Amino acid sequence: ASEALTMIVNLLRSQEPTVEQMRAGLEAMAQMSPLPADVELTTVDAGGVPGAWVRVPESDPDRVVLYLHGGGYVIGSIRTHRDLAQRIARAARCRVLLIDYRLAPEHPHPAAVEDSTRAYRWLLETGSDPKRMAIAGDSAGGGLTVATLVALRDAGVPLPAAAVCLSPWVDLEGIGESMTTKAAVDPMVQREPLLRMASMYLAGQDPRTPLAAPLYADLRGLPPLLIQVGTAETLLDDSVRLAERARAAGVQVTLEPWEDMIHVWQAFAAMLPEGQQAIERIGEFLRQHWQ
Numbered sequence: 146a147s148e149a150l151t152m153i154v155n156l157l158r159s160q161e162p163t164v165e166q167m168r169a170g171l172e173a174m175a176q177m178s179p180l181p182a183d184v185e186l187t188t189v190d191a192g193g194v195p196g197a198w199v200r201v202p203e204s205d206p207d208r209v210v211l212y213l214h215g216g217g218y219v220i221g222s223i224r225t226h227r228d229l230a231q232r233i234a235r236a237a238r239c240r241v242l243l244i245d246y247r248l249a250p251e252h253p254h255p256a257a258v259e260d261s262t263r264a265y266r267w268l269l270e271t272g273s274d275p276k277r278m279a280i281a282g283d284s285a286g287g288g289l290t291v292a293t294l295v296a297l298r299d300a301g302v303p304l305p306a307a308a309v310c311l312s313p314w315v316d317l318e319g320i321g322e323s324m325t326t327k328a329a330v331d332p333m334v335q336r337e338p339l340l341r342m343a344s345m346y347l348a349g350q351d352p353r354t355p356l357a358a359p360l361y362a363d364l365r366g367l368p369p370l371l372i373q374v375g376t377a378e379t380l381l382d383d384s385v386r387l388a389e390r391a392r393a394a395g396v397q398v399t400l401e402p403w404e405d406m407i408h409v410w411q412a413f414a415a416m417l418p419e420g421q422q423a424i425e426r427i428g429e430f431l432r433q434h435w436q
Protein backbone atom coordinates (compact mmCIF):
# COMPACT_ATOMS: atom_id res chain seq x y z
CA ALA A 146 0.00 0.00 0.00
CA SER A 147 0.86 3.77 -0.19
CA GLU A 148 3.56 5.02 2.31
CA ALA A 149 0.79 7.37 3.69
CA LEU A 150 -0.79 4.22 5.34
CA THR A 151 2.15 4.21 7.91
CA MET A 152 1.33 7.86 8.88
CA ILE A 153 -2.31 6.84 9.62
CA VAL A 154 -1.30 3.62 11.46
CA ASN A 155 1.08 5.68 13.73
CA LEU A 156 -1.77 8.15 14.56
CA LEU A 157 -4.00 5.10 15.45
CA ARG A 158 -1.26 3.26 17.49
CA SER A 159 -1.13 6.22 20.01
CA GLN A 160 -4.47 5.19 21.74
CA GLU A 161 -10.44 1.80 29.07
CA PRO A 162 -11.89 5.28 28.21
CA THR A 163 -15.49 6.15 29.31
CA VAL A 164 -18.25 6.71 26.68
CA GLU A 165 -18.05 10.53 27.30
CA GLN A 166 -14.20 10.37 26.73
CA MET A 167 -14.65 8.26 23.54
CA ARG A 168 -17.31 10.72 22.20
CA ALA A 169 -15.16 13.82 23.03
CA GLY A 170 -12.03 12.11 21.60
CA LEU A 171 -13.75 11.48 18.22
CA GLU A 172 -15.20 15.07 18.17
CA ALA A 173 -11.61 16.36 18.86
CA MET A 174 -10.12 14.20 16.01
CA ALA A 175 -12.85 15.52 13.60
CA GLN A 176 -11.77 19.20 14.30
CA MET A 177 -8.56 18.32 12.29
CA SER A 178 -10.61 17.88 9.01
CA PRO A 179 -10.97 21.40 7.53
CA LEU A 180 -14.51 21.53 5.97
CA PRO A 181 -13.93 22.94 2.43
CA ALA A 182 -15.49 26.41 1.87
CA ASP A 183 -17.71 25.14 -1.07
CA VAL A 184 -19.56 22.71 1.32
CA GLU A 185 -23.06 23.93 2.32
CA LEU A 186 -24.38 22.49 5.64
CA THR A 187 -28.08 22.92 6.58
CA THR A 188 -29.34 21.51 9.92
CA VAL A 189 -32.88 20.07 9.62
CA ASP A 190 -35.45 18.19 11.71
CA ALA A 191 -35.61 14.95 9.61
CA GLY A 192 -39.10 13.88 10.83
CA GLY A 193 -38.10 13.87 14.55
CA VAL A 194 -34.39 12.96 14.01
CA PRO A 195 -31.80 15.77 14.01
CA GLY A 196 -30.04 15.93 10.62
CA ALA A 197 -27.82 17.99 8.32
CA TRP A 198 -27.94 18.35 4.55
CA VAL A 199 -24.41 18.30 3.03
CA ARG A 200 -24.30 19.79 -0.51
CA VAL A 201 -21.31 20.67 -2.76
CA PRO A 202 -21.42 22.63 -6.08
CA GLU A 203 -22.00 19.57 -8.39
CA SER A 204 -24.66 17.99 -6.02
CA ASP A 205 -27.66 16.92 -8.21
CA PRO A 206 -30.30 18.20 -5.77
CA ASP A 207 -32.77 15.32 -6.60
CA ARG A 208 -30.20 12.57 -5.64
CA VAL A 209 -29.85 11.81 -1.90
CA VAL A 210 -27.68 9.52 0.26
CA LEU A 211 -28.99 8.95 3.78
CA TYR A 212 -25.64 8.60 5.60
CA LEU A 213 -25.48 6.55 8.88
CA HIS A 214 -22.23 7.31 10.82
CA GLY A 215 -20.16 4.63 12.61
CA GLY A 216 -19.02 4.67 16.24
CA GLY A 217 -20.21 1.28 17.57
CA TYR A 218 -23.82 2.60 18.07
CA VAL A 219 -22.33 4.55 21.05
CA ILE A 220 -20.24 7.48 19.62
CA GLY A 221 -20.08 9.70 16.55
CA SER A 222 -22.31 12.54 15.39
CA ILE A 223 -23.29 14.64 12.34
CA ARG A 224 -19.98 16.52 12.94
CA THR A 225 -17.55 13.50 13.16
CA HIS A 226 -18.63 12.12 9.72
CA ARG A 227 -19.25 15.47 7.93
CA ASP A 228 -15.94 15.17 6.00
CA LEU A 229 -16.76 11.60 4.75
CA ALA A 230 -20.29 12.88 3.85
CA GLN A 231 -19.02 15.89 1.78
CA ARG A 232 -16.49 13.60 -0.05
CA ILE A 233 -19.34 11.15 -0.97
CA ALA A 234 -21.60 14.12 -2.01
CA ARG A 235 -18.73 15.27 -4.32
CA ALA A 236 -17.96 11.83 -5.86
CA ALA A 237 -21.66 10.76 -6.22
CA ARG A 238 -22.71 14.33 -7.30
CA CYS A 239 -25.62 14.15 -4.80
CA ARG A 240 -26.88 15.66 -1.53
CA VAL A 241 -26.13 13.74 1.70
CA LEU A 242 -28.47 13.70 4.72
CA LEU A 243 -26.43 12.96 7.87
CA ILE A 244 -28.60 11.99 10.86
CA ASP A 245 -27.92 12.13 14.61
CA TYR A 246 -29.60 8.78 15.37
CA ARG A 247 -30.07 7.97 19.09
CA LEU A 248 -26.94 6.42 20.68
CA ALA A 249 -26.41 3.69 23.32
CA PRO A 250 -26.07 3.16 26.18
CA GLU A 251 -28.64 6.01 26.77
CA HIS A 252 -30.88 4.77 23.86
CA PRO A 253 -30.31 1.06 23.27
CA HIS A 254 -31.35 -1.00 20.20
CA PRO A 255 -33.77 -0.53 18.48
CA ALA A 256 -33.60 3.31 18.80
CA ALA A 257 -30.92 3.63 16.03
CA VAL A 258 -33.14 1.64 13.55
CA GLU A 259 -36.31 3.60 14.53
CA ASP A 260 -34.38 6.84 13.77
CA SER A 261 -32.84 5.67 10.46
CA THR A 262 -36.22 4.33 9.17
CA ARG A 263 -37.99 7.56 10.36
CA ALA A 264 -35.45 9.76 8.48
CA TYR A 265 -35.87 7.64 5.29
CA ARG A 266 -39.73 7.86 5.53
CA TRP A 267 -39.30 11.67 6.04
CA LEU A 268 -37.19 11.93 2.80
CA LEU A 269 -40.09 10.16 0.94
CA GLU A 270 -42.70 12.41 2.67
CA THR A 271 -40.76 15.57 1.58
CA GLY A 272 -40.61 14.42 -2.09
CA SER A 273 -37.37 12.33 -2.49
CA ASP A 274 -37.79 9.48 -5.04
CA PRO A 275 -36.38 6.04 -4.03
CA LYS A 276 -34.90 5.54 -7.57
CA ARG A 277 -32.64 8.60 -6.81
CA MET A 278 -31.87 7.56 -3.16
CA ALA A 279 -29.27 5.33 -1.43
CA ILE A 280 -28.42 4.49 2.21
CA ALA A 281 -24.73 4.36 3.19
CA GLY A 282 -22.82 3.95 6.45
CA ASP A 283 -19.51 2.92 8.03
CA SER A 284 -18.89 0.18 10.62
CA ALA A 285 -21.91 0.28 13.07
CA GLY A 286 -23.55 2.57 10.43
CA GLY A 287 -22.88 -0.09 7.76
CA GLY A 288 -24.75 -2.64 9.87
CA LEU A 289 -27.45 0.02 10.54
CA THR A 290 -27.69 0.49 6.70
CA VAL A 291 -28.57 -3.26 6.23
CA ALA A 292 -30.98 -3.25 9.26
CA THR A 293 -32.71 -0.07 7.94
CA LEU A 294 -33.30 -1.70 4.51
CA VAL A 295 -34.71 -4.90 6.21
CA ALA A 296 -37.01 -2.80 8.47
CA LEU A 297 -38.21 -0.59 5.54
CA ARG A 298 -38.88 -3.68 3.34
CA ASP A 299 -40.83 -5.43 6.19
CA ALA A 300 -43.03 -2.27 6.55
CA GLY A 301 -43.75 -2.22 2.79
CA VAL A 302 -41.74 1.02 2.24
CA PRO A 303 -40.15 1.36 -1.25
CA LEU A 304 -36.38 0.62 -1.06
CA PRO A 305 -33.71 2.94 -2.49
CA ALA A 306 -31.76 2.36 -5.76
CA ALA A 307 -28.66 1.09 -3.91
CA ALA A 308 -26.81 0.88 -0.57
CA VAL A 309 -23.16 1.19 0.53
CA CYS A 310 -21.49 -0.46 3.58
CA LEU A 311 -17.97 0.69 4.58
CA SER A 312 -16.34 -1.98 6.84
CA PRO A 313 -19.80 -2.95 8.16
CA TRP A 314 -20.26 -4.34 11.67
CA VAL A 315 -22.96 -7.07 11.43
CA ASP A 316 -21.69 -9.70 14.01
CA LEU A 317 -22.05 -8.26 17.58
CA GLU A 318 -20.32 -11.42 19.07
CA GLY A 319 -17.02 -11.02 17.10
CA ILE A 320 -16.88 -14.74 16.06
CA GLY A 321 -15.56 -14.10 12.50
CA GLU A 322 -12.23 -15.92 11.84
CA SER A 323 -10.60 -12.50 10.99
CA MET A 324 -11.44 -11.32 14.58
CA THR A 325 -8.57 -13.72 15.59
CA THR A 326 -6.36 -13.93 12.43
CA LYS A 327 -6.27 -10.13 11.65
CA ALA A 328 -6.03 -8.95 15.32
CA ALA A 329 -2.23 -8.52 14.93
CA VAL A 330 -2.58 -6.21 11.82
CA ASP A 331 -5.69 -4.14 12.94
CA PRO A 332 -4.63 -0.90 14.73
CA MET A 333 -8.24 0.29 15.47
CA VAL A 334 -10.79 -2.59 16.04
CA GLN A 335 -10.32 -5.48 18.52
CA ARG A 336 -12.82 -7.98 19.94
CA GLU A 337 -12.95 -6.44 23.49
CA PRO A 338 -13.98 -2.82 22.62
CA LEU A 339 -16.48 -4.24 20.05
CA LEU A 340 -18.08 -6.50 22.71
CA ARG A 341 -18.27 -3.49 25.13
CA MET A 342 -20.12 -1.41 22.51
CA ALA A 343 -22.35 -4.41 21.57
CA SER A 344 -23.19 -4.75 25.32
CA MET A 345 -24.24 -1.05 25.48
CA TYR A 346 -26.31 -1.28 22.24
CA LEU A 347 -28.07 -4.59 23.13
CA ALA A 348 -28.86 -3.81 26.84
CA GLY A 349 -29.18 -7.61 27.47
CA GLN A 350 -31.04 -8.40 24.20
CA ASP A 351 -30.00 -11.46 22.14
CA PRO A 352 -26.73 -10.57 20.30
CA ARG A 353 -28.22 -12.32 17.20
CA THR A 354 -31.27 -10.00 17.24
CA PRO A 355 -31.64 -9.54 13.42
CA LEU A 356 -32.10 -5.70 13.34
CA ALA A 357 -29.04 -5.35 15.71
CA ALA A 358 -26.89 -8.04 13.95
CA PRO A 359 -28.12 -8.29 10.34
CA LEU A 360 -25.87 -11.32 9.68
CA TYR A 361 -29.03 -13.05 11.14
CA ALA A 362 -31.60 -10.91 9.25
CA ASP A 363 -33.63 -11.87 6.17
CA LEU A 364 -31.93 -9.94 3.30
CA ARG A 365 -34.27 -11.02 0.46
CA GLY A 366 -35.28 -8.15 -1.89
CA LEU A 367 -32.52 -5.67 -0.80
CA PRO A 368 -31.26 -3.34 -3.60
CA PRO A 369 -27.73 -3.56 -5.04
CA LEU A 370 -25.11 -3.46 -2.21
CA LEU A 371 -21.48 -2.17 -2.39
CA ILE A 372 -19.41 -3.52 0.52
CA GLN A 373 -15.94 -1.91 0.86
CA VAL A 374 -13.62 -3.54 3.43
CA GLY A 375 -9.84 -3.60 4.18
CA THR A 376 -7.94 -6.93 4.37
CA ALA A 377 -6.10 -5.57 7.51
CA GLU A 378 -9.40 -5.59 9.48
CA THR A 379 -10.70 -7.81 12.28
CA LEU A 380 -14.12 -6.97 10.69
CA LEU A 381 -13.05 -8.42 7.28
CA ASP A 382 -15.16 -11.57 7.90
CA ASP A 383 -18.20 -9.36 8.77
CA SER A 384 -18.13 -8.09 5.11
CA VAL A 385 -17.37 -11.59 3.71
CA ARG A 386 -20.25 -13.21 5.70
CA LEU A 387 -22.60 -10.30 4.81
CA ALA A 388 -21.76 -10.75 1.06
CA GLU A 389 -22.38 -14.55 1.37
CA ARG A 390 -25.77 -13.98 3.09
CA ALA A 391 -26.97 -11.23 0.72
CA ARG A 392 -25.95 -13.26 -2.40
CA ALA A 393 -27.73 -16.39 -1.01
CA ALA A 394 -30.80 -14.05 -0.59
CA GLY A 395 -30.54 -13.03 -4.29
CA VAL A 396 -29.18 -9.49 -3.57
CA GLN A 397 -26.78 -8.03 -6.23
CA VAL A 398 -23.59 -7.67 -4.06
CA THR A 399 -20.27 -6.05 -4.97
CA LEU A 400 -17.71 -7.05 -2.29
CA GLU A 401 -14.48 -4.96 -2.64
CA PRO A 402 -11.67 -6.12 -0.31
CA TRP A 403 -8.94 -3.40 -0.49
CA GLU A 404 -5.52 -5.03 0.10
CA ASP A 405 -3.83 -3.88 3.39
CA MET A 406 -6.50 -1.19 4.10
CA ILE A 407 -7.52 -0.53 7.75
CA HIS A 408 -11.00 0.07 9.26
CA VAL A 409 -12.93 2.86 7.43
CA TRP A 410 -9.70 3.94 5.59
CA GLN A 411 -12.04 6.21 3.50
CA ALA A 412 -12.16 8.55 6.59
CA PHE A 413 -8.38 9.28 6.03
CA ALA A 414 -8.95 10.30 2.32
CA ALA A 415 -7.34 13.79 2.90
CA MET A 416 -3.91 12.05 3.43
CA LEU A 417 -4.55 8.42 2.24
CA PRO A 418 -4.77 8.02 -1.58
CA GLU A 419 -6.61 4.63 -1.31
CA GLY A 420 -9.17 6.54 0.86
CA GLN A 421 -9.98 9.01 -1.93
CA GLN A 422 -9.86 6.17 -4.57
CA ALA A 423 -12.40 4.14 -2.46
CA ILE A 424 -14.73 7.23 -2.21
CA GLU A 425 -14.47 7.76 -6.05
CA ARG A 426 -15.62 4.11 -6.38
CA ILE A 427 -18.60 4.79 -4.04
CA GLY A 428 -19.48 7.73 -6.31
CA GLU A 429 -19.22 5.58 -9.48
CA PHE A 430 -21.31 2.74 -7.90
CA LEU A 431 -24.10 5.19 -6.86
CA ARG A 432 -24.17 7.09 -10.22
CA GLN A 433 -24.32 3.64 -12.00
CA HIS A 434 -27.43 2.60 -9.95
CA TRP A 435 -29.07 6.05 -10.41
CA GLN A 436 -28.75 5.94 -14.31
Ligand SMILES: O=C(O)c1ccccc1C1c2ccc(O)cc2Oc2cc(O)ccc21
Nearest residue numbers: 169170171172173174175176177222224225
Ligand atom coordinates in the same frame (compact mmCIF):
# COMPACT_ATOMS: atom_id res chain seq x y z
O1 LIG B 1 -14.30 22.23 15.03
C1 LIG B 1 -14.99 23.30 15.15
O2 LIG B 1 -15.81 23.67 14.26
C2 LIG B 1 -14.82 24.17 16.32
C3 LIG B 1 -14.47 25.53 16.10
C4 LIG B 1 -14.28 26.40 17.17
C5 LIG B 1 -14.41 25.95 18.49
C6 LIG B 1 -14.74 24.63 18.72
C7 LIG B 1 -14.95 23.70 17.67
C8 LIG B 1 -15.32 22.29 18.10
C9 LIG B 1 -14.37 21.45 18.75
C10 LIG B 1 -13.03 21.80 19.03
C11 LIG B 1 -12.27 20.97 19.87
C12 LIG B 1 -12.70 19.70 20.27
O3 LIG B 1 -12.01 19.00 21.05
C13 LIG B 1 -13.94 19.25 19.83
C14 LIG B 1 -14.80 20.11 19.19
O4 LIG B 1 -16.08 19.69 18.99
C15 LIG B 1 -16.99 20.49 18.37
C16 LIG B 1 -18.25 19.92 18.23
C17 LIG B 1 -19.23 20.63 17.60
O5 LIG B 1 -20.48 20.04 17.45
C18 LIG B 1 -18.96 21.92 17.13
C19 LIG B 1 -17.71 22.48 17.29
C20 LIG B 1 -16.67 21.78 17.91
Ligand SMILES: O=C(O)c1ccccc1C1c2ccc(O)cc2Oc2cc(O)ccc21
Nearest residue numbers: 161162336337338339340341342343344345
Ligand atom coordinates in the same frame (compact mmCIF):
# COMPACT_ATOMS: atom_id res chain seq x y z
O1 LIG C 1 -13.22 -6.65 26.57
C1 LIG C 1 -14.36 -7.16 26.53
O2 LIG C 1 -14.50 -8.34 26.08
C2 LIG C 1 -15.47 -6.37 27.07
C3 LIG C 1 -16.80 -6.80 26.83
C4 LIG C 1 -17.88 -6.12 27.35
C5 LIG C 1 -17.64 -4.98 28.10
C6 LIG C 1 -16.34 -4.53 28.36
C7 LIG C 1 -15.21 -5.20 27.84
C8 LIG C 1 -13.82 -4.67 28.21
C9 LIG C 1 -13.15 -3.53 27.67
C10 LIG C 1 -13.59 -2.68 26.64
C11 LIG C 1 -12.63 -1.98 25.90
C12 LIG C 1 -11.49 -1.52 26.52
O3 LIG C 1 -10.84 -0.61 26.03
C13 LIG C 1 -11.11 -2.10 27.70
C14 LIG C 1 -11.82 -3.16 28.18
O4 LIG C 1 -11.25 -3.88 29.16
C15 LIG C 1 -11.88 -4.96 29.68
C16 LIG C 1 -11.16 -5.59 30.66
C17 LIG C 1 -11.70 -6.68 31.24
O5 LIG C 1 -10.96 -7.29 32.20
C18 LIG C 1 -12.95 -7.16 30.87
C19 LIG C 1 -13.66 -6.54 29.90
C20 LIG C 1 -13.15 -5.40 29.26
